[PDB]
RNA sequence: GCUUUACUGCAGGCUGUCGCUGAG
RNA sequence: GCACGGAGGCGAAGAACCAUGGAUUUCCGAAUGAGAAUCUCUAACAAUUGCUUCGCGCAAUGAGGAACCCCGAGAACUGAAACAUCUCAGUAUCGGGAGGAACAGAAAACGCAAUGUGAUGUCGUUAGUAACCGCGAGUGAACGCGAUACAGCCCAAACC
């Protein structure tokens, strides 16, 4: 397919969002990502 | 066009706003379809001016008749401003009565005249 | 900090302009001083960079330039 | 206001263009053309500007490819920052 | 031919997209409509009294 | 003394004798070949009209609107309906012609409101109606006595929510006793049986 | 759901009449 | 900030934090220069209107809102132990629109008929009364009264 900038703008933020929670998060909140997205076991928007 | 059935000739016209002019300075003139009426129906009327550009023309209709049945003379004018630039005013006028002429009684008496004639 | 808003004000309207583009330059090394995973960064800074930044064009408004 | 330039995009791959081709890497904003990138980098650093390519990258940012004249010296131009 | 499995493998088609002006996944881009806020057909925002339980 | 309005009231009382007649015969023809709302100078009925409101004045406006004449143009249920609600010939809208007058001419003139309006004849498949609207925000209008209560927020869209004079009429407000137990103070809040 | 000389109605077609609509 | 890490920083030049007012406020969005799945193309109140210096010069409309409110369109399941009028119901749902509340409102009223009452909402009652109805099932007011709150005016025309 041929995506537009702005779709582009979009996968690259869903990218982002894929990432985890950051190590120090877990020790400043003394203790899960659920926006987890599998780009085969899930579908994104548009 | 409804109300008029007598064509009155350009230069009579002329004559006509002639001595309306002259009446607004030497005698009494009335400006306005409302106040032209009463002149007509309280008799103090002489000669009543009514323009043929007037829409609707429901505002002048009773006028003819009207002038008829009370004997007041009436003529009538093509434009709407000329007949109100000659009663002295910065608009026009639908109609026009010359209540009691001025220095012009002459001129006007012969006026109804020639209209009369004109039939 | 180090740049209070009685020093801005203190400023004539070239002089924050000229403080103004100092501090984007300051900005714009520190953020490739990081970009390339330098670490002699000081956190406070590259922060109070800005700050100081808006705070000078909060000004400028005020002022008229 | 945007500014044209966001920071140095340094990376390996942004070296060799550094030490072998003469050109400088940098984000910069997505709503800049080539010829504002040109120009704000040659005011930036006092240089001049030879050819710029652009790419609107998977990272949400654009990434421009500025190569540099003869006459001036990437490998220098980024050791100052 | 099944109208099951093998029926869904010619299904790459692209019709609902996300919406300029709601944000859902509902602007049809062969219609140009939004059949989620209306967008498209509508300058008010599409909205039904049947979205809800009757005395709510 | 009988004002010259007297007299354009009195030739509309019979819009079919006298010279009313030739007018109108001659008027729609052309009429016929003007649009749905046609903004005129001057009101065809100028007693009519003064004494419903009008006045020349600046934010004064005045247009002809032409309705067709009739019943519903309704369609035939496409679904199960018990033979009481099937009929479609006999079926008229409950909002007469005037007020459909109105609103058209209202939506027209989006930022104007409509102060009143009356009939101007009909022929054989349409009526015409003139509309008197108002200028809310023009200052000659909201610094007349008379007419700034236009102004008012609440009087916004006016027309659409039956406070006009023809609004109030068809809504069965009229009467101030018996007969009107379901209309006043609303339609809506008598459970809608007027 | 379907049918028809089942019951009752509703579109549609035909036809008279009134309005548009006037002169001899 | 939630958020208790690491590093670093700010605060007696009175920070944090709270109140009020101001600044900033990307793109799409009624979305308004034009086009477009939030981007793009070469000055813009697009569109409809009022005024008009007839020039977008001055203005209006658009869309939103928990429900409430006003004006239009308007079912069927159901009840009648079937069903057609009736009933469900002017309900559900749909179209248009206002406000902080709407709407109504100073009698061509009432009609305890009077030597009487005196704008309008609403609450209590009048009353399941009068009235409607395959006179079946069902449906269903008002005047008055006791309260709440109270407020009365402007045109058209005559004559100027
Ligand atoms: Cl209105
Ligand atoms: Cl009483
Ligand atoms: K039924
Ligand atoms: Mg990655
Ligand atoms: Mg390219
Ligand atoms: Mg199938
Ligand atoms: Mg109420
Ligand atoms: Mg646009
Ligand atoms: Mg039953
Ligand atoms: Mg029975
Ligand atoms: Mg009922
Ligand atoms: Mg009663
Ligand atoms: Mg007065
Ligand atoms: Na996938
Ligand atoms: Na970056
Ligand atoms: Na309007
Ligand atoms: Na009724
Ligand atoms: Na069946
Ligand atoms: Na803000
Ligand atoms: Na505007
Ligand atoms: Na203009
Ligand atoms: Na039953
Ligand atoms: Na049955
Ligand atoms: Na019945
Ligand atoms: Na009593």
Redesign the interface.
């Given at each position: 397919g041929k995506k537009s900038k702005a779709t582009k703008k979009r996968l690259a933020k869903l990218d982002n969002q894929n990432s985890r929670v950051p190590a120090w998060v877990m020790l400043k909140t003394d203790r899960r990502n659920h926006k987890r997205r599998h780009w085969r076991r899930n579908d994104t928007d548009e | 066009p409804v109300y008029v059935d007598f064509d009155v000739p350009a230069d009579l016209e002329d004559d006509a706003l002639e001595a309306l002019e002259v009446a607004r300075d030497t005698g009494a003139v009335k400006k306005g379809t409302n106040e032209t009426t009463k002149s007509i129906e309280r008799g103090s009327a002489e000669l009543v001016f009514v323009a043929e550009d007037v829409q609707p023309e429901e505002i002048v209709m009773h006028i003819p008749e009207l002038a008829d049945e009370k004997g007041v003379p009436f003529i009538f004018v093509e434009q709407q401003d000329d007949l109100g630039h000659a009663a002295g005013l910065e608009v026009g006028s639908a109609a026009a009565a010359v209540t009691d002429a001025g220095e012009a009684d002459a001129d006007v008496e012969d006026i109804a005249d020639k209209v009369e004639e004109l039939r | 900090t180090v740049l209070h808003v009685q020093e801005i004000r203190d400023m004539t309207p070239a002089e924050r302009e000229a403080e103004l583009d100092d501090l984007k330059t300051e900005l714009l090394n520190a953020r490739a001083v990081q970009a390339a995973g330098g670490a002699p960064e000081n956190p406070g800074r590259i922060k109070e960079l800005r700050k100081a930044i808006a705070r000078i064009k909060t000004i400028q408004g005020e002022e008229g330039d | 206001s945007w500014?044209v330039?966001?920071?140095?995009?340094?990376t390996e791959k942004a070296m060799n263009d550094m030490d072998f081709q003469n050109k400088l890497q940098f984000?910069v904003d997505?709503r800049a053309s080539k010829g504002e990138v040109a120009d704000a980098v040659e005011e930036?650093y006092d240089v001049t500007v030879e050819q710029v390519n652009t790419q609107?990258?998977?990272?949400?940012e654009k990434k421009a490819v500025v190569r540099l004249s003869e006459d001036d010296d990437a490998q220098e131009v980024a050791s100052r920052? | 031919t099944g109208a099951g499995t093998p029926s869904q493998g010619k299904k790459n088609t692209t019709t609902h997209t996300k919406c300029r002006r709601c944000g859902e996944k509902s602007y049809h881009t062969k219609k140009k409509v939004c059949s989620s806020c209306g967008f498209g057909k509508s300058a008010k925002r599409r909205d039904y009294e049947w979205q809800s339980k009757a005395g709510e | 003394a009988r004002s010259a309005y007297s007299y354009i009231r009195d030739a509309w009382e019979n819009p079919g004798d006298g010279q009313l007649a030739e007018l109108q015969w001659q008027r729609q023809q052309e009429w016929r070949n003007e649009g749905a709302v046609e903004r005129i100078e001057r009101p065809t009925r100028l007693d009519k009209a003064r004494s419903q409101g009008y006045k020349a004045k600046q934010g004064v406006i005045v247009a002809r609107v032409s309705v067709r004449k009739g019943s519903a143009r309704k369609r035939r249920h496409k679904a199960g309906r018990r033979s009481k609600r099937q009929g479609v010939t006999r079926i008229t809208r409950r909002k007469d012609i005037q007020r459909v007058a109105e609103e058209r001419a209202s939506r027209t003139f989006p930022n104007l409101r409509v102060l009143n309006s009356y009939s101007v004849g009909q022929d054989g498949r349409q009526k015409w109606h003139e509309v008197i609207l108002i200028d809310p925000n023009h200052p000659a209008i909201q610094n007349d006595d008379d007419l700034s209560w236009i102004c008012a927020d609440d009087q916004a869209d006016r027309v659409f929510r039956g406070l006009t004079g023809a609004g109030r009429r068809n809504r069965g407000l009229s009467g101030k006793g018996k007969g009107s137990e379901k209309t006043r103070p609303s339609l809506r809040s008598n459970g809608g049986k007027a």
């Open positions: - | - | - | 500014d330039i966001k920071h140095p995009h340094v984000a997505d930036q609107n990258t998977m990272d949400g920052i | - | -």
